Amino acid sequence: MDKKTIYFICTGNSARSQMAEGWGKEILGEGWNVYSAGIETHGVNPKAIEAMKEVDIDISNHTSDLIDNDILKQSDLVVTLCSDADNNCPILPPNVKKEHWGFDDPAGKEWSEFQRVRDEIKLAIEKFKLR
Ligand SMILES: [K+]
Numbered sequence: 001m002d003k004k005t006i007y008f009i010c011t012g013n014s015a016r017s018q019m020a021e022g023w024g025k026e027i028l029g030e031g032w033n034v035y036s037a038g039i040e041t042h043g044v045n046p047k048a049i050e051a052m053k054e055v056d057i058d059i060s061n062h063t064s065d066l067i068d069n070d071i072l073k074q075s076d077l078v079v080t081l082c083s084d085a086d087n088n089c090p091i092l093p094p095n096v097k098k099e100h101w102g103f104d105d106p107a108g109k110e111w112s113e114f115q116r117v118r119d120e121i122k123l124a125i126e127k128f129k130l131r
Helices: 016-028 046-053 111-129
Strands: 004-010 032-038 077-080 098-100
Touching: 004 016, 016 032, 016 046, 016 111, 046 111
Parallel strands: 004 032, 004 077, 077 098
Antiparallel strands: none
């Protein structure tokens, strides 16, 4: 049937959302459109690219994108990764199917933190697929 769409959103579409897009494409498959966006665009975090390369997933061609209203309104599920009280978190429109998936921000930390968060996101998406 028709493709379903998942949208991972956060502050700068930099790390958590990029690793989620990378895992999402691999796990969910071609029957899903797997996108990611931010309220700002900070570029794809180098350590996030390296963390995904370690698990044989290439995210070097990903782009850091801004939130698109036509993808929010037409998505089957919008997943917020930006911590609700943290700083600069995106405002979501009403009736849009949403869930908050909380993972620690690996920004400015050692590569091990990117590995930890990468793996927490892996399991979250794997379990999501099996719902
Ligand atoms: K993106």
